[PDB]
Design a protein around this motif. Structure first.
Motif, mmCIF file in Angstrom:
data_model
loop_
_atom_site.group_PDB
_atom_site.id
_atom_site.type_symbol
_atom_site.label_atom_id
_atom_site.label_comp_id
_atom_site.label_asym_id
_atom_site.label_seq_id
_atom_site.Cartn_x
_atom_site.Cartn_y
_atom_site.Cartn_z
ATOM 1 N N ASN C 25 8.957 169.292 79.587
ATOM 2 C CA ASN C 25 10.157 170.447 81.133
ATOM 3 C C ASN C 25 9.289 171.909 81.324
ATOM 4 O OD1 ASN C 25 11.244 169.726 82.878
ATOM 5 N ND2 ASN C 25 14.132 169.913 81.632
ATOM 6 N N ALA C 28 6.266 171.369 82.525
ATOM 7 C CA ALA C 28 6.105 170.668 84.387
ATOM 8 C C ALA C 28 6.958 171.608 85.027
ATOM 9 C CB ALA C 28 7.394 169.660 84.176
ATOM 10 N N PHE C 29 7.670 172.581 84.608
ATOM 11 C CA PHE C 29 8.532 174.027 85.570
ATOM 12 C C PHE C 29 7.751 174.781 85.674
ATOM 13 C CE2 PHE C 29 13.174 171.791 84.306
ATOM 14 C CZ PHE C 29 13.156 171.032 85.520
ATOM 15 N N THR C 31 4.324 174.289 85.674
ATOM 16 C CA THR C 31 3.544 174.217 86.633
ATOM 17 C C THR C 31 3.385 174.396 87.759
ATOM 18 O OG1 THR C 31 2.355 172.555 85.315
ATOM 19 C CG2 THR C 31 2.439 171.917 87.440
ATOM 20 N N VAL C 32 4.891 174.029 88.376
ATOM 21 C CA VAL C 32 5.484 174.756 90.225
ATOM 22 C C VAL C 32 5.044 175.893 90.625
ATOM 23 C CG1 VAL C 32 7.718 172.396 89.904
ATOM 24 C CG2 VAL C 32 7.488 174.659 89.289
#
Lengths: 307, 143, 34
Positions: C25, C28-29, C31-32
């Protein structure tokens, strides 16, 4: 076989003869035609039973038969561990794990021959606690690529070489379109001194086999190659739809009888199984699965200490 | 009746002054055991129980030390790489659905969009010459 | 014997779920914002 059944129905004799050229002629700003079209215009060849689709521009020079099979342009893509398990991470990291495992336990034999373990277990722990997430995030990035793996996206890239068969209908569509994808396709084939174009279907197939080559042709060819080659598959669905017919002389009375006969063959559905019998050929006949074997060492090794 | 007003159809019929003004918009939908079958294929988590019970019974018999350590080793490698793969593919699926506008949906064929037949919308479009609208015209008219 | 052994194995296996999920997670966070 179409010729033979038409001969049976109409009681007409057909004589098959070839021509050097197989192209139908390209349409530039002036009127020119090659092969079948000019022969049919001159009314020197009684029939042209070569398969050709029904398009708007060539309905004014020749008569088509009513479509019986639907078709459209479609794209073909050439495709380039224990159960695909050793793929995402480099295979030179799993041995460091054994190294640390041996070295931490070697510390007992080094001490023999509290605070002593507070460093060893720490270095153990801080080192091996990296690899889980390392391989995790590596294959995360990998299959993240693999789930973002139409004509438009290829209309923004030519990193993969592609083309079209010489003197078709797609080129006329591309030039006669108004949206940027189709003119970009037209310009790509028109550029490169026609090298991006393919003269014949066979050497286009050779391009498909040798490297990743794509062709913008009618679908039935695409799933024909798919059924006759398992290293490739039809991509998506049709981009357009257009009619299908047989070359007949303009205003020829025989065209009506031929259409009546083929319609009569259509109601019985003979053409369906007719295409199906030549639709038969030679084509196509988990990640931690090997862990499931990798663990058989368990059901084997449960016996050594037993006796 | 609920009707539409534009230049071409106001020269063929008479109309009253507009009494409400609105525009055209696109509609979309508002949108525990999942993620346990798709990232990695399903037969895995069904054989995973055996993939535990193997070493479970191994060390059950071994205890009943060097051997215990070297079996727990292979088991611990085992766990390392398998959990890395699981959470890996899970994060991959999640990151894809995270990374993945009228332009965006128009430029992709994954979403299908259209309108009603014989409405004023097509008149309004085919009257115009807009690049965005021309790409939507091509998409809707295709197939 | 096996009694503490299954407990320890299950404990380690469970606790390596949460940290793996948190790492996923967090990546992924990250990444943004990049």
């Amino acid at each position: 076989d179409l010729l033979k059944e038409l001969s049976n129905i109409l009681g007409f004799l057909y004589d098959v003869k070839l021509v050097p050229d197989g192209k139908y002629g390209a349409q530039n700003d002036k009127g020119e035609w090659n092969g079948m079209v000019k022969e049919l215009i001159d009314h020197r060849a009684d029939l042209a039973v070569a398969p050709l689709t029904i398009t708007y521009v060539r309905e004014k020079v020749i008569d088509f038969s009513k479509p019986f099979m639907t078709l459209g342009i479609s794209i073909l893509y050439r495709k380039p561990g224990v159960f695909s398990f050793l793929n995402p991470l480099s295979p030179d990291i799993w041995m460091y794990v054994l190294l640390a495992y041996l070295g931490v336990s070697v510390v007992l034999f080094v001490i023999a021959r509290a605070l002593s373990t507070r460093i060893v277990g720490g270095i153990w722990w801080f080192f091996t606690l990296i690899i889980i997430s390392s391989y995790t995030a590596n294959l995360a990035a990998f299959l993240t690529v693999e789930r973002m793996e139409s004509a438009d996206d290829l209309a923004k890239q030519t990193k993969i070489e592609y083309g079209a068969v010489r003197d078709g209908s797609t080129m006329t569509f591309f030039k006669k379109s108004k949206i940027s994808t189709y003119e970009k396709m037209w310009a790509f084939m028109s550029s490169r001194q026609q090298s991006a174009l393919v003269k014949n279907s066979d050497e286009g197939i050779q391009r498909v086999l040798t490297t990743d080559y794509a062709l913008l042709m009618e679908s039935t060819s695409i799933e024909y190659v798919t059924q006759r080659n398992c290293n490739l598959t039809q991509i998506g669905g049709l981009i357009d739809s257009k009619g299908y017919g047989v070359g007949t002389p303009i205003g020829s009375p025989y065209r009506d009888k031929i259409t009546i006969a083929i319609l009569q063959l259509q109601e019985e559905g003979k053409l369906h199984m007719m295409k199906e019998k030549w639709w038969r050929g030679n084509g196509c006949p988990e990640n931690i699965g090997g862990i499931f074997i990798v663990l058989a060492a368990g059901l084997v090794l449960s016996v050594f200490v037993a006796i």
